[PDB]
Structures are given as C-alpha cells and as structure tokens.
C-alpha cells in the first residue's frame, strides 16, 4: 500500500551495502604504492583545425586513426583529414542545435543528434558524388545527448526523456527500450565487444545494460551531482565517470564498487569529458577552467596539464592506435596534441 | 612544392570548401536570436501569431533587420539552457489575469527567479510581457476575486508616482496591474549588477504592436552594453 512495500526497499538495499563491505579487502591506493610514477608528461600542439565559426559540441575519431568528424552549433558537420588539415566533406544540418555526433566503424556513415528529437543518419559513399541523409530516427520525446554505432545497421542512443533505445536502421524502428533512470541521461559508452554498455545520468547514478536481453544488471551510486561523461577501461572490467562536483571516479564491474577518486583542492569546476589512453595508464579529463588534466590512473596523482584553449573544453578523444589526442572547445578550434 | 598531382587537387578542394563556410558565416552575423519562454497557460501561442505576420522556430524581419526566435515545446530546465548563453534577449510571457486559479502566478514568480539567478545567463536580459489584460480588468472590478486574499501585501500598496494610466480606466485596475508589474521588478533590481535588465510591458490579445517593442528593446540592450565597457555608464 505504498508504505509497507517501500519498507522492503531499505530492507533489501542494506543487503547490497553490507555485501560490498565483505568483498573489500584492500584499496587501489594500497597496492600501487610501491610502483614508480610516470614522471611528467609534456605534450605539444601539432595541428590546429580552423573553420567552424561557432561553438563546438562533439567530435569522434575514425577507426583508421586519420579521419575525424566534429559538430558545431553553426549548423555544419565537417570531416577532417588530420595529417594534412584538409577538409573532406562539409555537411549542412536542418537544426542548428546539435549536441552529439558519431562515426561508423566501417567508415560509410555519420550520425548526429541535438535539440530536435530525431537522430539523422548520413551516407558518405554515394554514387552521385555528394553526401545525403538516408534516414531520420524519430520516436524520442526529448533532446538527444549521445549515440554510438554498433555496425552499419544498429545504433544505440540516449535521451533527455530518461530512456535509452536500440534502433534498427534499415526499417527505422525502435527494437529495445532501456528504462530505469530517474533524470536525464547525458552519456553512454560501448564495450570493446558490442554486447554491453554503460550510461550515466542526472540522478548521480550510472548503470550497466545488457544489449541482447535488455535489462539493467548493476547500479553504481557514489557521486554527489550530475554525471556528464563516461568511458570504458580498455580491458572491459572498469569504467570512469566525470561529474559537476569536480571529481572523477573509477568503478569496477566484478567487484561492483568504487575504488578510486581523482580530485584536487584547487579545482572546483565540473568535468565535461573523459577518455582513456590504451593500456589504461593515463586518464584525460576536460575541465571547465579552460584546461585539460592528465591523471595517473593507478595512484591518483596529477601528472600533466594541456593548456592552450581560450574557452570551455567540450570534448576529447584518443585514437585507436594511441598516437594523438584531439580536443574541442567553445572558441571554435580543434587541437591535435602529441 | 613536394605534393603529388592528386595531393594538389585535394588542397584545391579544401580551399573551395571554406570559401563557402565564410559566405555562410557572414550572412548570419547581424542576425539576432531570441529565446521565447513562458508558463504554458500564457498566450505565447498567439504572441507568435503577433510576432510573425522538438524545437520550433519563428523567423521575421523588421526594418531590414533579421530576428530569429525559438520555442522549446520541465522540472529541470537544466542541461539545455546552457546552449542559449549568447542570445540577445529572453522573451518572458506571463498571463497576468490568473492569480485565483490554484497558484499560477507564484509559479511564474518562482520561474523568473530561477532564470535570473542562473550561472549561464549572467549577461542575458529579459523582455517581460504581461498579457491577458482584457481578463484582468473584468476580474478586479465587478467581481469576486479580491487580490488582497491571495496576496497578503497588496492591501497597503499605494499607486506608484510613475504610473501612466491608459485614459478611461478605473484607479482600481491601475493599482492592481502595477502591483503585479512591480512584483517582477523586485527580483530583477536586486542582483543585476548592471550586467542585464528587465523590460516590462502591458499588452492584450488584439493589440498589434509587439514587433516594435522588441525591435526597440534590442537596440537599448546593445547600447547599454557597449556604454558600460567604455566607462560612460
């Protein structure tokens, strides 16, 4: 009667809280004490990409570590050639308010979302020479915040109507709906094998989803405010989040627990984006004081600063082979680092 | 001078692309963008009909100056209000005749205070509209409303000295419609710090003048911002 059955909430929730204390024998800061630090990391700006004329919201690296796509609120989608700073394509959008973009792992397609409730798919390799829109995916009742391709026919996405959805592109329909969040969903991250994904939301919680079945499996609550960024460890047994309360955290799957926090006392502003380097030693975060920090993921000890942006850092990604790091910002510039 | 014959034709493709990027970014430079908020029951549907002749977009032009309006058709207005941090003005529409519908005016006062004291709108100014004055006149006089019941501070409230009443109306509706106008000004003239200012108005459903009162306020917003940084104001 909504008073006795929600008395079984904390009757059941303290079983989970008093079993994460049983499976905690030590700390990540007690095991990585004896190893040496990485020293100092000194990256330089090698390239600078010019031409967006307005704020940049999202970018995504191609899978050959040479192409990239970026999205700006002037209504333009640009494909870059990062080695020579050439422009391959420039695609106009119908809505200027775009919030995300994605590059397909085959290289044939590009997706983008935004404040309209539809997710557009664009075809790059056409016979007639130009770039056309192939299908618009309608069915959400809020703004789109993130989207990632699985193959040329399946794309997953998150939205401001508190739900996530799996799509079939060739028909244009929703096939699976992931419900359970309370607030708006801001970010998602796919696994290296597209079988599970993770997503963080504005209720200070992140949860792990099974793609084929379609249900929640685990829930992680350690933050104090809204979660804006998420990314998997390259192993597939950990992920890391970034929030508004000036703290990144690292969570475990098989332990179902938080085991590291990345904070400093002179930082008070929120984290906008988070990525990993391969082997998972470096943890890069894009902050709100116009900088970018390069954390050491095993000892939680700050070991680098990527300064050089005039405005807010919006997005950052790392190539698949590990060569470069790109950063995007509100001052209409993209910078290719080390 | 080391490029291939195909490497030179890809450089020529890149220079032809950003020639079209500059001609698109220079035809959108002197276009002013307006964010239209509201409270649902207000007449922001029919103000769009006045200002004209997912998200929704209105486009009009006054005196060869282009304007560009938006409407986001809840509990958290966060995580999308930060996109509109470089607009010219926010247009706020409040139905000023609903104080007894229960409380549909304190709900509008709680919304205006959240918009004002937001960190992404520190330099954004608000054009305020108090429409449905046709319903406010028939409710104060010759009615059962008695504003002193729903608000416990209307009871003293002498009429301000800067009031310019429209000729023919009673002093009862003039003490009423200036009390609701000053309730919004008490939140704006408390933390503005010279960075942004409110601009109240009075309108109805059959009044057709509201494109001129947006054109004139957008000029006064830009003049008051450049005069502040030259230390003339």
């Amino acid at each position, epitope marked *: 009667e909504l008073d006795q059955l929600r008395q079984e909430a904390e009757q059941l929730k303290n079983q989970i809280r008093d079993a994460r204390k049983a499976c905690a024998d030590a700390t990540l800061s007690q095991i990585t004490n004896n190893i040496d630090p990485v020293g100092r990391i000194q990256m330089r700006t090698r390239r600078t990409l010019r031409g967006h004329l307005a704020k940049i919201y999202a970018m995504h690296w191609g899978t050959d570590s*040479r*192409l990239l796509v970026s999205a700006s609120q002037d209504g333009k989608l640009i494909i870059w*050639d990062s080695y020579t700073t*050439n422009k*391959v394509h420039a695609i106009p959008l119908r809505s200027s308010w775009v919030m995300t973009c994605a590059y397909a792992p085959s290289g044939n397609y590009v997706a983008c979302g935004g404040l309209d409730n539809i997710c557009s798919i664009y075809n790059l390799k056409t*016979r*007639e*020479g*130009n770039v056309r829109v192939s299908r618009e995916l309608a069915g959400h009742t809020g703004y789109l915040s993130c989207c990632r391709f699985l193959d040329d026919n399946q794309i997953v996405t998150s939205s401001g109507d508190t739900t996530c959805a799996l799509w079939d592109i060739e028909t244009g329909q929703q096939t699976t709906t992931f419900t359970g969040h309370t607030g708006d969903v801001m970010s998602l991250s796919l696994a290296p094998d597209t079988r599970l994904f993770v997503s963080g939301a504005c209720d200070a919680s992140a949860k792990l989803w099974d793609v084929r079945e379609g249900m929640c499996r685990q829930t992680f609550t350690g933050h104090e405010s809204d979660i804006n960024a998420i990314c998997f460890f390259p192993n597939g047994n950990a992920f890391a989040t970034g929030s508004d309360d000036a703290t990144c955290r690292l969570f475990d799957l098989r332990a179902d627990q938080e085991l590291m926090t990345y904070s400093h006392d002179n930082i008070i502003c929120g984290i906008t984006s988070v990525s990993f380097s391969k082997s998972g030693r470096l943890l890069l975060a894009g902050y709100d004081d116009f900088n970018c920090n390069v954390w050491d993921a095993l000892k939680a000890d700050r070991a680098g600063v990527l300064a050089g942006h005039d405005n807010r850092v919006s997005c950052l990604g790392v190539t698949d082979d590990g060569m470069a790091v790109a950063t995007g910002s509100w001052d209409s510039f993209l910078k290719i680092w080390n | 001078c*080391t490029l*291939s*014959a*195909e*490497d030179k*034709a*890809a450089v*020529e*493709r890149s220079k*032809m692309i950003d020639r079209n990027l500059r001609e698109d970014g220079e035809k959108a430079a002197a276009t002013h963008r307006l964010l239209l908020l509201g409270a649902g029951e207000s007449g922001k549907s029919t103000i769009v009909k006045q200002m004209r002749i997912g998200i929704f977009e209105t486009k009009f032009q006054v005196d060869k100056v282009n304007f560009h309006m938006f409407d986001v058709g809840r509990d958290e207005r966060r995580k999308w209000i930060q996109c509109f941090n470089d607009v010219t003005a926010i247009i706020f529409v409040v139905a000023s005749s609903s104080y007894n519908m229960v409380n549909r005016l304190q709900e509008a006062l709680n919304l205006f205070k959240s918009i004002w004291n937001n960190r992404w709108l520190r330099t954004i100014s608000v054009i305020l509209f108090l429409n449905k004055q046709d319903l406010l006149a028939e409710k104060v006089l010759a009615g059962k409303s008695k504003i002193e019941d729903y608000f416990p501070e209307f009871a003293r409230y002498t009429t301000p000295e800067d009031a310019t009443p429209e000729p023919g109306e009673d002093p009862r509706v003039t003490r009423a419609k200036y009390f609701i106008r000053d309730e919004f000004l008490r939140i704006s003239t408390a933390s503005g710090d010279g960075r942004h200012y409110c601009y109240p108005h009075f309108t109805c459903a059959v009044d057709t003048e509201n494109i001129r009162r947006v054109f004139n306020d957008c000029r006064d917003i830009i003049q008051r911002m450049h005069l502040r940084q030259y230390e003339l104001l």
Partner: single-chain antibody
Framework: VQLVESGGGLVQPGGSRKLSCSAS????????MHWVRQAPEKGLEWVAY????????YYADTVKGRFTISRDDPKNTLFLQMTSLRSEDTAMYYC??????????????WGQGTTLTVSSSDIVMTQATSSVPVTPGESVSISCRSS???????????LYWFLQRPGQSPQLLIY???NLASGVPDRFSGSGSGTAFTLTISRLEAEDVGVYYC?????????FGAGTKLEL
C-alpha cells in the same frame, strides 16, 4: 549517371569544330573532367583537364596552344574547342569524370565517345606483350612497367588499370595498384612494387575478353600503356 557526347563529323583539314559532353544524374560541379582520345589503330592518349571550379587547366604537348577547354557549371555541359585540325587528329574523344579527396576513386566513369574523322622527361609506360591466349578455367597474368618509380614519399603508388571489352568504352578495375572499384568481382587483384606491376585474373568468365591498359597518375601529362589483347 550519364555522359553523352555529340559534335563529331567529317572536318576538312584546317577548319574548326566544337564538342560537347552533356552530364546527367550526378553533382557535376564537384567533379573534375578530362578528355581522352583513341586513334583507330593506336591505344589511349590523354588530351586535356579542367578542375572543379575552373581553377586548373592542363594540356598535352601535341595540342597545347591549339585546343581550348571550358565548362558550364549550372547547365552541366563540358566543351572542347578545336582549331586547325591536322590529319593526326582522327580519334574517338571520350569524357571522363574524376573527383579527388582522401580515399576517392578517380577515373571511375567514362562516356561513349564521338567520332571525328579528318580527311586529307615523360614517364614511358611499357606493356610488352601483344596477345595472350586464354581458356575460361585458368589463371592469366598481365604486366606493365615504368621508366620511373611511381611510389611517392607519402606512401601511395599511382598506377591504374582499365579494361575495354570490344564495342564498348573502358572501365576502371584497379586504382592505386591495390584497390578494387565498385561493382567489380574480387577475382581481379593487382600487385607489384616500385617499377614492376602485375594484374591477376583467376577464373575467367566469357566477359573477360578485350584489351587491358595501364596508366600512371604521378605527374602531368598522363601516359597510358600500349595495351594487351586477350583472346580465346
């Protein structure tokens, strides 16, 4: 995608003639165009070029200063103006579209050609085989060679392969020595390094009968091979 040429005919030696290439079905203004001719007892020979935007125009040395190329973008029409036609200007003039960016495929669509009868340092590409007999079950290999190494310092190798089955216009098989064109079966495969190149056919159907050409695209002018005829 369509390209239709018209304008050819019998020209007295010394006059003039206009040619047209009417495009249809694709975004004509973002493509660069070429003219390629073929004398009735010779192979393929490049003529001219005009870039996307009319900002780069090249010519061949046997027509430089005598031929004029021009394009009309919003009417989708390519022009070639010839003056003082010699007796060695008897060929079939083709019209080829070509786009250039990272990963693109140049020279991937040809027209049908018009006929113009006239009454009365360079990289040399060597294709030193006249004819090869085949039978539709067995492998066959063609070779081509160059005076200069076509490998560039970035990492590309600008060698192309074309096939002209008789009674038709050529088509693209291999671009940049390793990559298949669209709508081509995977039994074709090119290989080589630096100066020696090979094209491989595994199981011949009845359609794999005709002349095979090799082209280089390292620098201008573009020089073809002599051609290798396959026959049953």
């Amino acid at each position: 995608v369509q390209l239709v040429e018209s304008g050819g005919g019998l020209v007295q030696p010394g006059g003039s003639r206009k040619l047209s290439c009417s495009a249809s079905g694709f975004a004509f203004s973002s493509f660069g165009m070429h003219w390629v001719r073929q004398a009735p007892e010779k192979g393929l020979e490049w003529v001219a070029y005009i870039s996307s935007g009319s900002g780069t125009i090249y010519y061949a040395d046997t027509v430089k200063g005598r031929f004029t190329i021009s394009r009309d973008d919003p009417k989708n029409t390519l022009f070639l103006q010839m003056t003082s036609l010699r007796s060695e200007d008897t060929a079939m003039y083709y019209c080829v579209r070509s786009i250039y960016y990272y990963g693109s495929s140049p020279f991937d669509f040809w027209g049908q050609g018009t006929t113009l009868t006239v009454s009365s340092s360079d990289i040399v590409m060597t294709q030193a085989t006249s004819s090869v007999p085949v039978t539709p079950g067995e492998s066959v290999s063609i070779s081509c060679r160059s005076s200069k190494s076509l490998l560039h310092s970035n990492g590309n190798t600008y060698l192309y392969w074309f096939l002209q089955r008789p009674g038709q216009s050529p088509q693209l098989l291999i671009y940049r020595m390793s990559n298949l064109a669209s709508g081509v079966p995977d039994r074709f495969s090119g290989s080589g390094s630096g100066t020696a190149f090979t094209l491989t056919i595994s199981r011949l159907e009845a359609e794999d009968v005709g002349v095979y050409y090799c082209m280089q695209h390292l620098e201008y002018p573009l020089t073809f091979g002599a051609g290798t005829k396959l026959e049953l």
